[PDB]
Design a protein around this ligand. Structure first.
Ligand SMILES: Nc1ncnc2c1ncn2[C@@H]1O[C@H](CSCC[C@H](N)C(=O)O)[C@@H](O)[C@H]1O
Ligand SMILES: NC[C@H](O)c1ccc(O)cc1
Length: 257
């Protein structure tokens, strides 16, 4: 965990959201696959409400694009100050923000509502009310009196739990912890790495718990979810680049009983 004290948001973005993994042109790439899942899922319209919270946003916004059109109050979170700062730069259109436009575009491409991408980005930026510090290891991750409407109508998290838990159990408790933020009946949209054991972010070298699909199923079940959809994307040869050892990527649409 103290390893996260050397994490570099720029180097992370560059490693995971710039070419090649971030060249969205090939539909068989991982960025399209993620966006498509998110988009397909909301497009069902069974996932809806007023508030929503993103767990462990890090410096990234893509996980929220298709989403932001179904929830008026969006809360973003991360454990580091430096990421919350990077998010800020893009939320306020400040100088040196990261360019998510190619993502917004595909968001718009995939949803098929003929929306323009500036509209999408504007809708997001407006609906993100607050960026909050968070620790998923605490039994009350946000703290005591968090400015976040609780309980949330849904949650979204990508590459967080799997990335901050040393081992399976640690993962499992982390899940329990955030599931407390989710209203009963609410939805969890979860994305993470499959059989990833490390990944770089500049000077930082994070050690991670290589999870599998069945392990993710069993763990959502244990935390009290009905698994509505669980899908697996296998990382293709040319997307393996020595910033990590990830083998595939999972997406899960879970409902709290
Ligand atoms: N104890 C903790 N609780 C919640 N998040 C934590 C955490 N420790 C580290 N993190 C955060 O987990 C994030 C993992 S990187 C994932 C970022 C983004 N959701 C993605 O789609 O890429 C990092 O930003 C890191 O700061
Ligand atoms: N745990 C993060 C890992 O490096 C990662 C993050 C995002 C991806 O699209 C693929 C892999």
């Amino acid at each position: 965990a103290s390893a996260y004290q050397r994490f570099e948001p720029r180097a992370y973005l560059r490693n995971n959201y710039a070419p090649p993994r971030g060249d969205l042109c090939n539909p068989n790439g991982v960025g399209p696959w993620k966006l498509r899942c998110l988009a397909q899922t909301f497009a069902t319209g069974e996932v809806s409400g007023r508030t929503l919270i993103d767990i462990g946003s890090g410096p990234t916004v893509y996980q929220l694009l298709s989403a932001c059109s179904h929830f008026e109050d969006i809360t973003m979170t991360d454990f580091l100050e430096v990421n919350r700062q990077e998010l800020g730069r893009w939320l306020q259109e400040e100088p040196g923000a990261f360019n998510w436009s190619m993502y917004s575009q595909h968001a718009c491409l995939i949803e098929g509502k003929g929306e323009c991408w500036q509209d999408k980005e504007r809708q997001l930026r407006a609906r993100v009310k607050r960026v909050l510090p968070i620790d998923v290891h605490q039994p009350q991750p946000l703290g005591a009196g968090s400015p976040a409407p609780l309980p949330a109508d849904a949650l979204v998290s990508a590459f967080c739990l799997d990335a901050v838990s040393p081992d399976l159990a640690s993962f499992q408790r982390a899940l329990d912890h955030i599931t407390t933020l989710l209203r009963p009946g609410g939805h969890l949209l979860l994305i993470g790495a499959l059989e990833e054991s490390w990944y770089l972010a500049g000077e930082a070298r994070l050690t991670v718990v290589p999870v599998s699909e069945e392990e993710v199923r069993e763990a959502l079940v244990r935390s009290g979810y009905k698994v509505r959809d669980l899908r697996t994307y296998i990382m293709p040869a040319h997307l393996q680049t020595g910033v990590d050892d990830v083998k595939g990527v999972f997406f899960a649409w879970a409902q709290k009983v």
